[PDB]
Structures are given as structure tokens and as C-alpha cells.
Design a protein around this ligand. Structure first.
Ligand SMILES: OC[C@H]1O[C@@H](O[C@@H]2[C@@H](O)[C@H](O[C@@H]3[C@@H](O)[C@H](O)O[C@H](CO)[C@H]3O)O[C@H](CO)[C@H]2O)[C@H](O)[C@@H](O)[C@@H]1O
Length: 266
């Protein structure tokens, strides 16, 4: 069952950082289901350096995310990238994800993002690392895509008000649009998921039974079409409040969630 998930998203609490030994215990819970994890920032909590050490000791692999937001984060993260290359073995890195939903939020303009991606590529290419960015299905303009090695989609049919029976179909439909803007380059999925509690969003109902169905349906759909997927997410994060606190495959205390069975729908 170690090949059920291609990979899983791993959240970090910025107000209460983990340690190397802490991450190792966390990744051991996931090891029967997966061999890959993904982190969202480099310098915050020194998480990249610690996750590189944790995964390498357990024979697992990793996607490294760069968190770019306000003007400061461009310089701050680039300097942290430089330090990783000088201080760490990076042979188990499957890719570097420059920003998550940068264009959706309106943090910078398409040309500025395109230029920043080029600087990153010039640095990591000699180490044989591939570059991407992650955003919503309708935010992949040609100027950005030209600088990429591959594309990564974030899509959540729950926030769109789509019913559970149609949810996986909509995801695949959104995937086709990204391919339409891909210029022929590989397209992966960096985040999708479904909440187990917190109420509803229009016709989208949050329940344990619905998260279980969504998990099964999405895993089948990606296996049929040979799409690489990073599922969202590993553990429930209570410090996020409401709906955002129930996206985990397993519980916040690291035990399993009753009603969730970890398997693909086909
Ligand atoms: O740790 C670095 C950085 O983390 C930021 O919080 C991120 C969230 O932005 C992210 O949000 C998810 C989206 O990426 C995804 O598309 O949708 C889901 C469901 O709506 C979102 O939860 O989640 C990750 C993992 O929990 C967080 O690390 C902080 O905002 C930022 O302050 C911090 O620097």
C-alpha cells in the first residue's frame, strides 16, 4: 500500500516549530501509505533543512516549496535556497515549487514572477533540479509557462460549491484546462482535498463519509490517466480553525480517522 499516494502535503505550524526527530516520527506514520512528502516554505521554521534530513534518513523523497508573498519573501527565500545548496544533500528532491497561488492572490504581476523563476532555474539546474509553480486552473499565462519545466494545479471543488457526486469529474475538467495552457509541458497536481467537518459551502457538504468518497474517487481518476498527485493533506491542523482544520487523512494526534479507509477507487 506504499504506492496508494504518489505523495502527501505536509503542514507546519509557524508559531510552534517541529524538530528533526519530530518530523521523523510524523513521516513514519505515512510510510506504509507513501514515499513522498511536500513542504510549503524554505526559511520558515527552518523546515526545508529539517525535512531534507528527516526524509533522507528514512529513504523517502521530497518536493520543496518556496513561499513568496510580500516583497521581502523574494530576497528571504532566495538566500535560504542558496544556504540549502551549500549545506545539504539535495539528491532526493523531485522538484522546486516557486510560489503557491501568487497570481490568484495578486501578490505580483506575471512578468515579475516570470523573471524570478528564471533566476531560480539558473541556480538549481546545475544540481539537476526541475522547477515549477503552483496556482489555480485559470492562472497560467504564457509568459510564466515559458520559464517552467512542469506545471502544478491547485483545485478544490468544495470551495466552488460542487456536490460530492460530481466533485471528481470537475477536478479532471479543471485539469484539462491547465493542459490547454501547458505548451506541451508535463502537468501535475500539487493540491486537492475534502474536509471532514465544519459545515457546508452551498451544496458542498463536509463529512467523514464525503472525504472518504472523494479520496477514493480522485485516486482512481489520476491512476487511469497516469497523473502525478500530491494529496491535501497528511494531518488535521486545529490551529487553522473551522473547515481548514479537517483536511487531514489522519488525525491531529497522529492516530487514524475513524471512517477513513486508505485505498484507491479503482
Ligand atoms: O509555512 C509557510 C507559510 O504557510 C502559509 O500557510 C499555508 C497555506 O497557505 C496553505 O493553504 C492551503 C492552500 O495551499 C490550498 O490551495 O488550499 C487549502 C484549502 O483551502 C489551503 O489550506 O496550507 C499550507 C499547509 O497547511 C500552509 O502552510 C501561511 O499563510 C504563511 O504565513 C507561512 O509563511
Amino acid at each position: 500500500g506504499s504506492q496508494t499516494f504518489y505523495g502527501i502535503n505536509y503542514g507546519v505550524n509557524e508559531n510552534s516549530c517541529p524538530t528533526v526527530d519530530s518530523m521523523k516520527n510524523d513521516f513514519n506514520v505515512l510510510k506504509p501509505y507513501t514515499n513522498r512528502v511536500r513542504t510549503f516554505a524554505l526559511s520558515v521554521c527552518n523546515q526545508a533543512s529539517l525535512a531534507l534530513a528527516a526524509t533522507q534518513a528514512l529513504g523517502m523523497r521530497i518536493y520543496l516549496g518556496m513561499w513568496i508573498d510580500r516583497p521581502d519573501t523574494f530576497d528571504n527565500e532566495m538566500n535560504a535556497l542558496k544556504n540549502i545548496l551549500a549545506n545539504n544533500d539535495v539528491s532526493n528532491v523531485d522538484g522546486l515549487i516557486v510560489g503557491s497561488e501568487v497570481l490568484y492572490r495578486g501578490d505580483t504581476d506575471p512578468q515579475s514572477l516570470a523573471n524570478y523563476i528564471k533566476q531560480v532555474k539558473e541556480l538549481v539546474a546545475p544540481h539537476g533540479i526541475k522547477v515549477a509553480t503552483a496556482d489555480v486552473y485559470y492562472k497560467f499565462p504564457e509568459v510564466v509557462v515559458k520559464e517552467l519545466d512542469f506545471l502544478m494545479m491547485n483545485a478544490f471543488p468544495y470551495w466552488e460549491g460542487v456536490t460530492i457526486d460530481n466533485a471528481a469529474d470537475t477536478l479532471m475538467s479543471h485539469y484539462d484546462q491547465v493542459v490547454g495552457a501547458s505548451l506541451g509541458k508535463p502537468v501535475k497536481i500539487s493540491a486537492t482535498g475534502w474536509p471532514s467537518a465544519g459545515g457546508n459551502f452551498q451544496s458542498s457538504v463536509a463529512s467523514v463519509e464525503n472525504e472518504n468518497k472523494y479520496l477514493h474517487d480522485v485516486l482512481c481518476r489520476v491512476k487511469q490517466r497516469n497523473i502525478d498527485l500530491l494529496y491535501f493533506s497528511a494531518f488535521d491542523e486545529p490551529y487553522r480553525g473551522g473547515v481548514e482544520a479537517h483536511f487531514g487523512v489522519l488525525g491531529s494526534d497522529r492516530n487514524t480517522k475513524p471512517g477513513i479507509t486508505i485505498e484507491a477507487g479503482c
